[PDB]
Design a protein around this ligand. Structure first.
Ligand SMILES: [Zn+2]
Lengths: 49, 241, 111, 59, 94, 173, 181, 91, 99
C-alpha cells in the first residue's frame, strides 16, 4: 500500500504542473529565456467584477 | 540558451514599449534608453537600423516583479510610453531602468527610495537616464517631496512594508490623476506571516476599495515568485460603484 | 417647367420643383447643389422641414420626405394628391391640402 | 471459380449453395462451366479479387 | 469487464495467404474489403452528381468570365500552367 | 451616357449607419488558485473567516444557535464571522417582523465587510468574493446558493441543520 | 441629428426622423432591393393584388368547412396561383394567407427567372440585358423587366438569335456556327 | 523592405516551425503569423539557420527522422503497386 | 484518384468545370534561364524541406491523437448523459406523485 500511494502522489505532482504553474525554487544559473515561448495575446489574471 | 552569437527576431508585445525576442527561446526585452551599457548585468541585443546601432535590454522575470506580471499575462498596464509614473520602493535600477525604458524620452519616472546605500546607485543610474528623478525620501510622508512631484498617470508600489496600504493611499491622493493607474506588488510574508497568503490578498484588496481604488485584476507570480501577487486597479475618485 | 420655388426659413437654401418632376435643393449663395431628383412624375410643390436637411415633395398622388442628399426617407401614404405643402416650424407639423378637400397635419418628429 | 470441384457433375449437386470469401463477400453457385471440368460460375454481392479465397461451408 | 475471465478475452490470431497463392498478394480480410467498398462508393457518388450536373446544364447560361476562359478542340477547358513577353522584356532578360 | 438598371435612391435599413440598430455594430483564461491542490484547499487554516448569509441568521435564531459559539462548536476553532452590506441591507428590508434578526446581526463580535457595487443582491456578492479569494467559508441554507458554491472548488460550505451547524467541504474536521 | 444625451432621450423617446410606423419597417424598400425593382409603386400594386387574394381566402374560410362552394373555389385559387408560379405548392389552403406575399410575385419577374436559370450572374445584370434587347420570350423580344413569367412560359425564355451574348456562349465552347447567325 | 532576404525569410520560417527542431523542447501551442514590423538582432555579452546545420547531432536527427517519414509516405503507393503486378508475372 | 469521363467533363456547367492542367513538353525559355544556387544554398535548401517535413508530420500525428481521444470521450459523455436523463425522469414521476 505504501508504494502505491508513493507512486500515486508523485503522479499527481506531475499533473498539477500541467494544471497550473508551480514554484520550483526560482532561477538556477544564467537566465536562459522563456523556454516554452511567450504568448502575446493570452492573459491569465483573475478579473474582479 | 541565449548565448552570445545567437541571432533573434525582435517583435512588439501587446503592451506598448515592450518587445519580444524570438528564437529557440523567447525573451522579454525593452529598448535601451542609454545604449552600450547594462544596469545590472542583463544581456543586451543590438539591431542595425538604417545605419544607427540601436540596442535592447533583457528583462529578467526572476529579478523584476513587474516583468513576472508580463509573463503571467496581465491584461492592462498603465505604464506606457509618454506617461509619468511614480515608482515607490525603487531599491535600484533593476526594475526602474526597465520602466524608464518603457515610458521613453517623453515620460518621466519618479523613483522614491528610503535607504541611502541603495539610493546612491539610484542617483548614479539616474544620470544615464535623464527621465528618472530620484527622490531619496520616505514614502510614508509624501508631504516631504510634494514640491518634487507633479501629477502622475500611474503609481507603481513595490514597497515591502506591513502598512503599504496606507503608503499607497497617501501617495495616490496627492499625485495620482483621476481614473489613473495603480499597480501593487503584494508579498504576503511581509504584511502578515501569521495568516495564509489568500487571506492577506483579500485584506489588501479590501483596503484599496476603502481608499477609492477599484481593483481591476489580480495575478500571482508563480513560478517566478512564491506567495506574491500583483493587483492592478484604477483610481476612481468619483465612485467605485 | 414651370418651376415652384421655396426658400428656407433662414434664406440660406433654395428648393425648386419643376412640374415635370425636376427637384433641386441648393445653397444658392455658394452655388452648391445639395440634391437633384429627376422624378419622372408630376410634382406640384415642395417645402423644407425644420432645416435644409429634410424636404417634402408633393408628387402625382403621394407626398415623399427626402434627405439632405436626396435619399427618399418616407412615402406618406395618408396624404393623397396634396397640391400645397406648409411646415409650422415651432410645432414640427407638415400641412397638406389638395383635390380631396382634406386638411392633414403630420408630425415629422414622431411621424 | 476453380479447384472447388473435380467434375461438372459435382457442381450440379451444389448449384444455389451459399458461398463466401475470406473477406466476407457472400455469393452463390450459379452454374457449372462446360470447360474445364469442375469450374463454375458464381455471383457475389460485390466484386472480388484474385487474392481472395472462396469457401463453401458444409457439415 | 464483469463476470468475464481473461481467458475468454483471448486474442484470436489472423491467418495468412497460402504459399501456392503468394504471387497474387495479400489475403484481404473484412477490414481490407471495407476500405475498397467505401472508396468505390465515394467515387461513384461524385460521378453520379457530375453526370447529373451535365444533364441539367442550361445551354443559355452566361458568365462574364467566358471571355477569359478558353476551351480545347476536344471540348475540354484549357487551364494555363501558371496564372507572352514583350520584345523589350525579352531584350532585358537576354 | 445614362447608366442601365437605374433605381431610385432609398434608405437601406440594413446598412445605414444612422439607424440605431446599425449604430451599435486578448483572450482571458483565469489562473487556477495556487491555494488549491486539485479539490483540496491547502491554504485555508484557522482562524477561519465565514461569510454569513441572510437566511443563516434566521435559521440560527429558530434553532437557538449562537452565531459565534455555534461556529466554534462546529469547527473547533476561532471563527471570524463577516456580514457584508448586502446581507445587512437584506435584513433591513425584511421589515419589522425580523427586527430580532437585525439586532443579533449587529452584535459587535460580528465584523462588517464593505461593498462597492450598486446591487443589493447578496447571493451574487458572496459568489464573486469566493471566486476571487479562496479564504472564506460560506454560511448559508439557501438551496440555490449552496449548489453554486459546491461547483466552485475549495470553498467550504457551512449550514445550520438539526440542532447545530454543519460544515461540508473542510477536511480538517 | 446628433446623439441625444441622457436627459434628452428620456424627453424625446418617440423621436425618429428615419423610421416611422407608417413605413411598415421599410418592407417595400427591402423587397425592391432584393429583386431590383425600379418603379417605386410596383411593390404597392403587387401588395394590393396580394390583399385581394387574402381577402377572398378569409371570406372562404368563414364558409362552413363541408361547403362544396368553399372547396371548389379554394382549389381554383390554388390552381391558378400555382400555375402563375406565385405558389410553390398546392397541398395546403393556409398557404393562401401565410405564403401569398409580394416577394412571391416579384420572384416571377423576368430578371429573377433569368437569374435562376443562370442566364445572368445577378438580377441587376439580368435587368441590363433585358433593357439592352438581348432577351426574348417565345418569338417576342421583351425589354420590360417587370414581365411576369408563368411556369409554362419559363420554357421559352431565351436569348435573341443575333445576340452578342449568344455568340460568346458558343465561341467559349467552340460551337459557333456562322451559318445560323 | 519588400526584398525579403532569403536568409531572413528562412529564419522566420525556422521560428514558425521551431517545435520540430529538437525532440525535447515542446513549446506552447501558438501560431506566430509573421509580424508586420520586426528587427533581427544579435546578443551582446552565424545566422540561426547556419548555426543549426553546423551541429551534427541535429543533422543526424533530421536525416533519420526525415527518412522514416519517407518510408511511411511511400508505403502502398505506386512503387508498391508495381511490385504486386510484377509478382503475378512469372519472373 | 477519381477520373471523370471526358464526355461527362465536356458537357459540364460553367460553374463546375474541372481544371486539368496538361504537362509541359517543350522547354520554356524561362525554364532554360532560371539559375539555381548550388553548393551552400543547396544544403540550406535541403535542410528547410527536411524541417518542414518533420513539422507537418508531427502536427498530423498529434492532431490524430485528439481525434482518437475525442471519440473515446464522447462515448464516456453519452453514458453520463443517459444516466442524467433516466434519473431525471424518475424524479419527475416522484414529484408529480405528490401532486
Ligand atoms: Zn455586496
Amino acid at each position: 500500500s505504501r508504494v502505491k500511494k508513493r507512486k500515486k502522489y508523485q503522479k499527481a505532482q506531475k499533473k498539477l504542473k500541467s494544471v497550473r504553474a508551480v514554484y520550483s525554487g526560482g532561477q538556477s544559473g544564467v537566465y536562459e529565456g522563456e523556454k516554452t515561448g511567450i504568448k502575446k495575446g493570452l492573459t491569465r489574471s483573475v478579473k474582479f467584477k | 540558451g541565449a548565448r552570445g552569437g545567437a541571432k533573434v527576431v525582435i517583435e512588439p508585445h501587446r503592451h506598448a514599449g515592450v518587445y519580444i525576442a524570438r528564437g529557440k527561446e523567447d525573451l522579454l526585452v525593452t529598448k535601451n534608453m542609454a545604449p552600450g551599457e547594462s544596469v545590472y548585468g542583463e544581456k543586451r541585443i543590438s539591431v542595425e537600423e538604417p545605419p544607427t546601432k540601436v540596442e535592447y535590454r533583457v528583462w529578467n522575470p526572476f529579478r523584476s516583479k513587474l516583468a513576472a506580471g508580463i509573463m503571467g499575462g496581465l491584461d492592462e498596464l498603465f505604464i506606457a510610453p509618454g506617461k509619468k509614473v511614480l515608482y515607490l520602493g525603487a531599491a535600484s535600477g533593476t526594475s526602474v531602468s526597465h520602466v524608464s525604458d518603457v515610458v521613453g524620452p517623453e515620460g518621466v519616472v519618479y523613483a522614491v527610495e528610503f535607504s541611502h546605500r541603495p539610493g546612491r546607485e539610484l542617483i548614479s543610474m539616474a544620470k544615464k537616464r535623464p527621465n528618472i528623478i530620484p527622490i531619496i525620501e520616505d514614502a510614508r510622508h509624501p508631504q516631504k517631496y510634494r514640491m518634487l512631484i507633479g501629477m502622475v498617470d500611474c503609481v507603481f508600489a513595490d514597497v515591502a512594508q506591513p502598512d503599504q496600504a496606507r503608503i499607497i493611499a497617501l501617495n495616490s491622493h496627492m499625485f495620482l490623476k483621476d481614473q489613473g493607474g495603480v499597480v501593487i506588488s503584494i508579498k504576503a510574508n511581509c504584511i502578515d506571516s501569521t495568516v495564509d497568503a489568500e487571506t492577506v490578498f483579500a485584506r489588501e484588496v479590501q483596503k484599496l476599495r476603502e481608499e477609492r481604488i477599484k481593483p481591476l485584476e489580480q495575478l500571482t507570480l508563480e513560478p517566478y515568485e512564491r506567495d506574491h501577487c500583483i493587483v492592478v486597479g484604477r483610481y476612481m475618485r468619483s465612485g467605485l460603484k | 417647367g414651370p418651376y415652384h420655388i421655396k426658400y428656407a426659413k433662414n434664406g440660406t437654401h433654395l428648393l425648386i420643383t419643376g412640374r415635370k418632376g425636376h427637384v433641386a435643393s441648393m445653397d444658392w449663395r455658394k452655388g452648391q447643389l445639395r440634391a437633384e431628383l429627376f422624378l419622372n412624375e408630376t410634382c406640384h410643390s415642395a417645402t423644407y422641414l425644420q432645416n435644409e436637411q429634410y424636404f417634402a415633395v408633393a408628387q402625382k398622388k403621394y407626398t415623399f420626405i427626402y434627405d439632405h442628399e436626396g435619399t427618399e426617407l418616407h412615402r406618406l401614404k395618408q396624404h393623397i394628391e396634396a397640391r400645397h405643402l406648409d411646415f409650422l416650424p415651432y410645432h414640427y407639423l407638415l400641412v397638406t391640402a389638395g383635390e380631396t378637400g382634406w386638411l392633414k397635419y403630420h408630425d415629422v418628429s414622431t411621424g | 471459380i476453380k479447384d472447388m470441384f473435380s467434375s461438372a457433375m459435382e457442381v450440379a449437386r451444389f448449384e444455389g449453395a451459399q458461398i463466401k470469401t475470406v473477406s466476407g463477400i457472400r455469393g452463390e453457385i450459379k452454374r457449372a462451366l462446360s470447360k474445364p471440368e469442375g469450374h463454375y460460375r458464381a455471383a457475389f454481392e460485390d466484386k472480388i479479387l484474385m487474392s481472395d479465397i472462396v469457401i463453401l461451408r458444409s457439415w | 469487464a464483469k463476470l468475464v475471465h481473461d481467458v475468454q478475452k483471448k486474442q484470436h490470431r489472423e491467418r495468412s495467404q497460402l504459399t501456392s497463392r503468394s504471387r497474387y498478394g495479400f489475403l484481404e480480410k473484412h477490414k481490407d474489403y471495407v476500405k475498397r467498398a467505401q472508396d468505390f462508393h465515394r467515387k461513384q457518388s461524385t460521378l453520379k452528381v457530375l453526370r447529373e450536373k451535365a444533364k441539367e446544364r442550361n445551354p443559355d447560361e452566361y458568365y462574364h468570365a467566358m471571355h477569359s476562359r478558353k476551351t480545347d478542340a476536344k471540348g475540354l477547358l484549357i487551364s494555363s500552367r501558371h496564372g507572352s513577353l514583350s520584345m523589350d522584356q525579352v531584350k532585358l532578360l537576354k | 451616357t445614362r447608366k442601365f438598371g437605374l433605381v431610385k435612391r432609398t434608405l437601406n435599413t440594413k446598412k445605414d449607419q444612422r439607424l440605431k440598430k446599425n449604430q451599435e455594430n486578448t483572450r482571458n483564461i483565469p489562473q487556477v488558485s495556487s491555494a488549491l491542490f486539485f479539490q483540496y484547499n491547502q491554504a485555508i487554516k484557522p482562524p477561519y473567516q465565514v461569510l454569513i448569509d441572510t437566511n443563516f441568521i434566521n435559521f440560527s435564531i429558530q434553532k437557538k444557535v449562537d452565531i459565534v459559539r455555534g461556529m466554534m462548536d462546529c469547527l473547533l476553532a476561532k471563527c471570524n464571522p463577516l456580514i457584508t452590506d448586502c446581507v445587512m441591507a437584506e435584513l433591513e428590508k425584511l421589515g419589522p417582523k425580523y427586527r430580532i434578526a437585525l439586532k443579533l446581526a449587529r452584535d459587535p463580535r460580528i465584523k462588517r465587510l464593505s461593498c462597492s457595487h450598486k446591487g443589493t443582491y447578496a447571493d451574487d456578492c458572496l459568489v464573486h468574493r469566493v471566486l476571487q479569494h479562496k479564504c472564506y467559508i460560506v454560511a448559508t441554507n439557501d438551496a440555490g446558493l449552496k449548489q453554486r458554491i459546491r461547483k466552485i472548488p475549495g470553498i467550504p460550505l457551512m449550514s445550520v441543520g438539526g440542532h447545530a451547524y454543519v460544515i461540508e467541504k473542510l477536511p480538517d474536521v | 441629428v446628433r446623439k441625444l444625451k441622457h436627459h434628452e432621450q428620456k424627453l424625446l423617446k418617440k423621436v425618429d426622423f428615419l423610421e416611422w410606423k407608417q413605413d411598415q419597417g421599410h418592407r417595400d424598400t427591402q423587397v425592391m432591393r432584393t429583386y431590383h425593382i425600379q418603379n417605386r409603386e410596383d411593390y404597392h400594386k403587387y401588395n394590393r393584388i396580394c390583399g385581394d387574394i387574402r381577402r377572398l381566402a378569409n371570406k372562404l374560410s368563414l364558409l362552413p368547412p363541408t361547403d362544396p362552394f368553399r372547396r371548389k373555389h379554394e382549389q381554383l385559387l390554388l390552381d391558378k396561383l400555382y400555375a402563375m408560379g406565385v405558389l410553390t405548392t398546392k397541398s395546403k389552403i393556409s398557404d393562401l394567407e401565410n405564403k401569398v406575399t409580394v416577394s412571391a410575385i416579384c420572384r416571377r419577374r423576368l430578371p429573377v427567372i433569368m437569374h435562376r436559370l443562370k442566364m445572368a450572374e445577378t438580377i441587376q445584370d439580368a435587368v441590363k440585358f433585358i433593357e439592352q434587347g438581348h432577351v426574348r420570350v417565345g418569338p417576342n423580344l421583351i425589354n420590360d423587366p417587370a414581365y411576369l413569367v408563368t411556369r409554362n412560359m419559363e420554357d421559352y425564355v431565351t436569348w435573341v438569335d443575333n445576340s452578342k451574348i449568344k455568340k460568346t456562349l458558343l465561341r467559349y465552347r467552340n460551337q459557333i456556327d456562322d451559318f445560323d447567325f | 523592405d519588400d526584398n525579403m532576404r532569403r536568409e531572413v525569410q528562412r529564419d522566420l520560417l525556422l521560428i514558425k516551425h521551431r517545435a520540430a527542431l529538437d525532440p525535447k523542447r515542446h513549446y506552447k501551442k501558438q501560431r506566430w503569423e509573421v509580424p508586420e514590423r520586426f528587427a533581427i538582432g544579435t546578443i551582446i555579452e552565424s545566422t540561426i539557420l547556419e548555426t543549426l546545420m553546423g551541429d551534427e547531432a541535429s543533422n543526424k536527427y533530421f536525416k533519420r527522422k526525415y527518412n522514416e517519414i519517407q518510408e511511411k509516405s511511400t508505403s502502398g503507393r505506386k512503387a508498391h503497386y508495381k511490385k504486386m503486378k510484377e509478382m503475378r508475372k512469372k519472373r | 484518384g477519381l477520373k471523370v469521363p471526358k464526355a461527362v467533363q465536356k458537357e459540364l456547367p460553367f460553374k463546375s468545370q474541372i481544371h486539368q492542367m496538361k504537362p509541359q513538353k517543350k522547354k520554356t525559355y524561362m525554364a532554360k534561364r532560371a539559375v539555381v544556387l548550388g553548393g551552400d544554398e543547396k544544403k540550406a535548401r535541403s535542410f528547410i524541406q527536411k524541417v518542414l517535413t518533420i513539422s507537418k508530420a508531427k502536427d498530423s500525428k498529434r492532431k490524430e491523437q485528439k481525434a482518437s481521444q475525442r471519440k473515446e470521450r464522447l462515448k464516456k459523455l453519452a453514458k453520463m448523459e443517459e444516466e442524467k436523463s433516466q434519473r431525471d425522469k424518475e424524479k419527475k414521476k416522484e414529484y408529480f406523485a405528490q401532486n
